[PDB]
Amino acid sequence: VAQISPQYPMFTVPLPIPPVKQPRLTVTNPVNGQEIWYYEVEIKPFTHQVYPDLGSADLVGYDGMSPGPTFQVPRGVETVVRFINNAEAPNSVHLHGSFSRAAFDGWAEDITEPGSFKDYYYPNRQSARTLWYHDHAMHITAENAYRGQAGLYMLTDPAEDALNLPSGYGEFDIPMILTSKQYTANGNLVTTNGELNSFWGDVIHVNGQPWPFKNVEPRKYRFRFLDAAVSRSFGLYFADTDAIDTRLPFKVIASDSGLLEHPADTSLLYISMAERYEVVFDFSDYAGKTIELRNLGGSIGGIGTDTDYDNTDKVMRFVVADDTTQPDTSVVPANLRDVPFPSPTTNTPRQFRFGSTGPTWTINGVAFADVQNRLLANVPVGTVERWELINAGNGWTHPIHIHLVDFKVISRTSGNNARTVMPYESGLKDVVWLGRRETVVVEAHYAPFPGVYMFHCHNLIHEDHDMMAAFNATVLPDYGYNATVFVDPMEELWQARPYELGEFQAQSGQFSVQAVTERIQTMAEYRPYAAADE
Numbered sequence: 001v002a003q004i005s006p007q008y009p010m011f012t013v014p015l016p017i018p019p020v021k022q023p024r025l026t027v028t029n030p031v032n033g034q035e036i037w038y039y040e041v042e043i044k045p046f047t048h049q050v051y052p053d054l055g056s057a058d059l060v061g062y063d064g065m066s067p068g069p070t071f072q073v074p075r076g077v078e079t080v081v082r083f084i085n086n087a088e089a090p091n092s093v094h095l096h097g098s099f100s101r102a103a104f105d106g107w108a109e110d111i112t113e114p115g116s117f118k119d120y121y122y123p124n125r126q127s128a129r130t131l132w133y134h135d136h137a138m139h140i141t142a143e144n145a146y147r148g149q150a151g152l153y154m155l156t157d158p159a160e161d162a163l164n165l166p167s168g169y170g171e172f173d174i175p176m177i178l179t180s181k182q183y184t185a186n187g188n189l190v191t192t193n194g195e196l197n198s199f200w201g202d203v204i205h206v207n208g209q210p211w212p213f214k215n216v217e218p219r220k221y222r223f224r225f226l227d228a229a230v231s232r233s234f235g236l237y238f239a240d241t242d243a244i245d246t247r248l249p250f251k252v253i254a255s256d257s258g259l260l261e262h263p264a265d266t267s268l269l270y271i272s273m274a275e276r277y278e279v280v281f282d283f284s285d286y287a288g289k290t291i292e293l294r295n296l297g298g299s300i301g302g303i304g305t306d307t308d309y310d311n312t313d314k315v316m317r318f319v320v321a322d323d324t325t326q327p328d329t330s331v332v333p334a335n336l337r338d339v340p341f342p343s344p345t346t347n348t349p350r351q352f353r354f355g356s357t358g359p360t361w362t363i364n365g366v367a368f369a370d371v372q373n374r375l376l377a378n379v380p381v382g383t384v385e386r387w388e389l390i391n392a393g394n395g396w397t398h399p400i401h402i403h404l405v406d407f408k409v410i411s412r413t414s415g416n417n418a419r420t421v422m423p424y425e426s427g428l429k430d431v432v433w434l435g436r437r438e439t440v441v442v443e444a445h446y447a448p449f450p451g452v453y454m455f456h457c458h459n460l461i462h463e464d465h466d467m468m469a470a471f472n473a474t475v476l477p478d479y480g481y482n483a484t485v486f487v488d489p490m491e492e493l494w495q496a497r498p499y500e501l502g503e504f505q506a507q508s509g510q511f512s513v514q515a516v517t518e519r520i521q522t523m524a525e526y527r528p529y530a531a532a533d534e
């Protein structure tokens with residue numbers, strides 16, 4: 001259908017690369033003698049000239065940019081991030097892909113008001129994976145994410161580095177953060193406010209830039225795909241501009257939770273809101289060509305319900321040089337890793353229906369705001385459960401996310417007989433797309449931390465009104481590990497605190513090296529992540 005946003009000069013602006021976020025300082029953890037990396041992020045307003053010849057867009061971003069800066073954290077290094085709200089609305093930061101404690105996980109009611117900050121303590125102990133950090137504030141997650149509160153968080157480890165995959169952040173390892181937005185006639189953003197169905201968007205962005213291009217050499221690149229859109233799901237494929245409908249093969253090497261056991265040879269990648277897939281594309285057979293990254297129409301080939309617009313079949317262009325300037329020393333091994341799959345269970349699976357209750361998107365008839373009813377499962381820590389995630393509807397799709405866990409996709413049935421489990425769903429994930437009339441069974445180890453966690457649809461419009469619920473990963477009162485201060489996401493110990501911008505700017509008072517060092521060493525003594533040792 002006709003583009004609504006003004007006409008854009010397609011494939012004329014280079015793909016931006018978010019800068020790497022550096023820690024401000026390190027603090028010795030008195031528990032283990034190891035260095036904790038401490039970071040400060042200021043959430044604040046900024047303008048960005050998206051349309052060359054119109055006005056600017058009003059955004060709110062981590063460190064005044066969108067996407068937020070990229071974190072790059074070695075496995076085993078604990079991080080503390082001071083998220084400082086200097087904006088106009090509350091925030092709640094979630095690190096998507098991290099088994100964070102309940103009070104460091106971005107619980108939707110666990111907000112920071114403007115003129116407050118919160119310190120988030122992250123374990124970084126899971127398998128090498130592409131995480132992302134983004135807003136989770138109750139009822140305003142769609143508008144906070146849409147206006148710029150999302151960024152990448154790469155968890156790295158030597159074992160993955162030894163595979164010799166294409167490497168170097170911004171060299172041959174490229175972030176590909178997809179969004180779908182809409183602009184006014186003067187080049188400002190159309191708000192998601194008031195939208196209760198889906199905000200599709202008619203402008204496709206990579207790393208915050210409409211329809212970019214990149215100069216590539218004829219060799220192998222690792223692309224880290226993330227669907228950070230409010231509502232748009234994608235069917236990604238690559239094509240030579242000399243044969244724009246001919247799909248070129250590539251390899252998926254990783255899903256949400258890390259490496260697949262083996263690369264999945266693929267010509268079409270379904271990716272829905274909050275899914276991460278890492279792809280290796282070999283440009284060597286296309287020296288001197290232009291390869292367009294494109295998006296499947298027909299509402300992702302009948303899987304989705306998304307509206308299609310004139311230019312939503314276009315993502316970006318890669319202009320391939322005639323030659324490499326340096327040898328391609330990278331490879332994609334046939335064997336990537338032993339995926340740590342959960343033990344099969346015979347426990348009769350729980351059922352969750354993703355539908356509506358009057359004008360509200362619900363789970364088993366319940367809206368997140370409804371405290372009395374929204375706690376839908378008690379799961380003893382250590383237990384493996386199958387959850388049957390049901391989309392009975394033909395008129396909506398729902399990428400379902402479960403906090404804390406990594407899960408295996410056991411099965412998919414389609415009431416449109418459209419598809420079962422995709423080859424790139426063979427490993428571990430934390431989001432799974434319920435297409436039209438789809439039921440998916442996932443299996444997860446509810447481990448290793450007790451606490452109250454969210455699960456929900458990651459269509460941020462659905463999530464906000466109000467397709468989200470909670471589970472309690474439970475322990476018996478003799479469990480230990482300071483569980484009584486780490487189960488409650490709203491625990492007073494970990495709540496946000498007020499700051500004065502002067503102190504922040506001068507790095508004085510509670511921002512002094514001394515105050516930060518004392519505050520982090522005190523936090524570290526509670527031993528939040530001790531139960532994940534081994």
Ligand SMILES: *[C@@H]1O[C@H](CO)[C@@H](O[C@@H]2O[C@H](CO)[C@@H](O[C@@H]3O[C@H](CO)[C@@H](O)[C@H](O)[C@@H]3O)[C@H](O)[C@H]2NC(C)=O)[C@H](O)[C@H]1NC(C)=O
Binds near residue numbers: 474476484
């Ligand atoms: C989520 O599950 C956790 C358990 O993993 C629940 O917290 C547990 O709640 C029980 C009942 O309040 C606590 O026992 C109580 O202890 C106090 C004082 O020592 C006593 O006054 C009461 O008679 C009772 O025995 C238990 O300590 C607590 N466990 C932990 C580890 O905090 C929690 O309530 C559940 N959350 C929700 C929202 O349902």
Ligand SMILES: *[C@@H]1O[C@H](CO)[C@@H](O[C@@H]2O[C@H](CO)[C@@H](O)[C@H](O)[C@H]2NC(C)=O)[C@H](O)[C@H]1NC(C)=O
Binds near residue numbers: 481526527530
């Ligand atoms: C639970 O948290 C408390 C409070 O941080 C920890 O108590 C500290 O432990 C170290 C070593 O035992 C002492 O030198 C500190 O003086 C303790 N502080 C206080 C205020 O008691 C405790 O270690 C933690 N327990 C577990 C199992 O994690």
Ligand SMILES: [Cl-]
Binds near residue numbers: 172329330
């Ligand atoms: Cl490389």
Ligand SMILES: [Cl-]
Binds near residue numbers: 198395396397
């Ligand atoms: Cl919808």
Ligand SMILES: [Cl-]
Binds near residue numbers: 067148207208
């Ligand atoms: Cl953006």
Ligand SMILES: [Cl-]
Binds near residue numbers: 324326327328329
């Ligand atoms: Cl080479």
Ligand SMILES: [Cl-]
Binds near residue numbers: 500504509
């Ligand atoms: Cl202050």
Ligand SMILES: [Cu+2]
Binds near residue numbers: 094096134274401458
């Ligand atoms: Cu998320």
Ligand SMILES: [Cu+2]
Binds near residue numbers: 097402
């Ligand atoms: Cu999450």
Ligand SMILES: [Cu+2]
Binds near residue numbers: 354397398458462467
């Ligand atoms: Cu949904």
Ligand SMILES: [Cu+2]
Binds near residue numbers: 094136401403454456
């Ligand atoms: Cu969430």
